[PDB]
Amino acid sequence: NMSFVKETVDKLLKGYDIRLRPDFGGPPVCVGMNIDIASIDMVSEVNMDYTLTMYFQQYWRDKRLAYSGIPLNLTLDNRVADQLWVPDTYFLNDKKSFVHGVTVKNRMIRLHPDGTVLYGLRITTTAACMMDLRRYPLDEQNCTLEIESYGYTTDDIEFYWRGGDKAVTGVERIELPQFSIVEHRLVSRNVVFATGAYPRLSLSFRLKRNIGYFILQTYMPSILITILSWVSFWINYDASAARVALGITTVLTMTTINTHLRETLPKIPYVKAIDMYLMGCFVFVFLALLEYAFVNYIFFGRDVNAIDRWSRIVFPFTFSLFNLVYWLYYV
């Protein structure tokens, strides 16, 4: 009887006070939360945030909503949620979030005979992630999602992961070209403010950046230009025009790489690991041009070939030592 189901739901909402939490004035209401990750759209270093799409399900029991005589789980229209109490769950580090509303609002309400409420939302959220980019691009970030109740303290509400470690699924669905998911973790804790103590659920991912793009596009061109600057060491010292043109161009080429690479990479206003590598490579090409200026300065006075001969060994060896220390430190 479609009329009997309508009458049962109308009776529930005639004497239901949304201003009061379940078991108001008594024991705290326990809210179980499970997340089904749909995708992670973009991880932004410039904005220090990431975009996450997920199915956010909350699970709590409200004895006022218990109904008898209907052996079914009522799937109601999403507009009935406006007449029911829901937890005031918010994301502390979220910067901009919305619920998808095409073709209708992506919202689910499911009721159970004992009063249990399953409440699911399809949410796309941009959550803040203060990334430490000191090892960029060989860095490993840890981006979390803080889940907390805003108005209700631990004496009113309790959060827990429904299913334990199995509360968050779909992590294997995450396909990021620049990152790979190494580990995800579920944390349940209490956070104390001036207004009281609040339940906190934390979902954190450890993102490992892939180095392949930067080896091909940034590290390799820098190395070959630095190796290119060593060609001057194998040219005779009377070829002043040839060796200055090689030295000046590579110095200018190295700057052009840096000034244009930074315009592509995320322009964070501090020094990254690559900024140490590019500045180190600039020094090598700068020392190579300074190396000839020393040779050109003293072959006039009278071991002149010795400076060139030792430069063919010291520069490749020191750059190898520079790479050995650099790569062992950041890997």
Partner: protein, 343 residues
């Protein structure tokens, strides 16, 4: 719960939220405190900054007195729209967002004596006028002013909940500054007169100091090494004219490339920053180095260099000999004056 439902109904029975507490009788005192969960990024181009706060306001409303089994009512945030709240706005705010996911990020608490605690989670983009004459060695005081939009000081006054220093709290790990250091904040209150009356203004100044580490590696060091590099040409013999002309011309191109990209991180301000003076002087040295070679090349008597055997050869230019000392010394003197002036 049924008892509490009756109490809430009695509070709002005959309650008019269009009128402030004690309207026509006394000034409404609003006690305010701010908890900064994250001090967001600062934008030099827009002369703005972002801050995420818990904005707490407290005031007394005798119409909301109640007696019951509990002393504090922790109600849903929809109750805030059923009662009078202060019309607090941020004077320098540009575009602020009150977060509403998954519910309105607001809390309302009513004590039995009529005291209200009203908190909301906000993301505020406030104006911060910046004088960038010392960029990047510059410091700023970004204000955050708030008060009543419509109620004058004869109707609504604002006070800090505790001592002004302790009324603004920054989260220990809530910093989102990439190139600034939050040295601290100063808190003050005053009166501002406008075309509609006198209003109470509550002012918080955040003192920022930009970190120069990024611009030392990116701009100053390449500019200093390029200028030092351009003075290396003074140690080449005056006979190698094509070699030194390539050296002088290509470094001016290198300086031009570094000059062009250095202005990418600044607003098109009409004045010259401290970094613009440094680049202008660095450009002057590189250009002056090529003019120095052009003078030496003008007097060059012989086109052939020293053969290494002993027929006369060009003597080392007196201009070149002095330029090896004057150019490094003047650039060293300028740096000593430049960095002492700004640091």
């Amino acid at each position: 719960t049924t008892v509490f439902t009756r109490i809430l109904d009695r509070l709002l029975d005959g309650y008019d939220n269009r009128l402030r507490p004690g309207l026509g009788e006394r000034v409404t005192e609003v006690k305010t405190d701010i908890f900064v969960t994250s001090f967001g990024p600062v934008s030099d181009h827009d002369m703005e900054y972002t801050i995420d706060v818990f904005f707490r306001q407290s005031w007394k409303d005798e119409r909301l007195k109640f007696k019951g089994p509990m002393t504090v009512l922790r109600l849903n945030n929809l109750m805030a729209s059923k009662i009078w709240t202060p019309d607090t706005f941020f004077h320098n705010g540009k575009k602020s967002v009150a977060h509403n996911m998954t519910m309105p990020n607001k809390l309302l608490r009513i004590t039995e004596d009529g005291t209200l605690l009203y908190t909301m989670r906000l993301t505020v983009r406030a104006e911060c006028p910046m004088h960038l004459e010392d960029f990047p060695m510059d410091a700023h005081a970004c204000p955050l002013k708030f008060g009543s939009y419509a109620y004058t000081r004869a109707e609504v006054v604002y006070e800090w909940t505790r001592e002004p220093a302790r009324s603004v709290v920054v989260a220990e790990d809530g910093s989102r500054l990439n190139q600034y250091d939050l040295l601290g904040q100063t808190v003050d209150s005053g009166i501002v007169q406008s075309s509609t009356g006198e209003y109470v203004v509550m002012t918080t100044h955040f003192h920022l100091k930009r970190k120069i580490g990024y611009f030392v590696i990116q701009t100053y060091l390449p500019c200093i090494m390029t200028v030092i590099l351009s003075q290396v040409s003074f140690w080449l013999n005056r006979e190698s004219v094509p070699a030194r002309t390539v050296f002088g011309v290509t470094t001016v191109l290198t300086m031009t490339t570094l000059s062009i990209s250095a202005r990418n991180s600044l607003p098109k301000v009409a004045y010259a920053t401290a970094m613009d003076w440094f680049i202008a002087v660095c450009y002057a040295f590189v250009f002056s180095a090529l003019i120095e070679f052009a003078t030496v090349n003008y007097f060059t008597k012989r086109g052939y260099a020293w053969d290494g055997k002993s027929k006369t050869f060009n003597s080392v230019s007196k201009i070149d000999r002095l330029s090896r000392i004057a150019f490094p010394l003047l650039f060293g003197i300028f740096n000593l004056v430049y960095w002492a002036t700004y640091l």
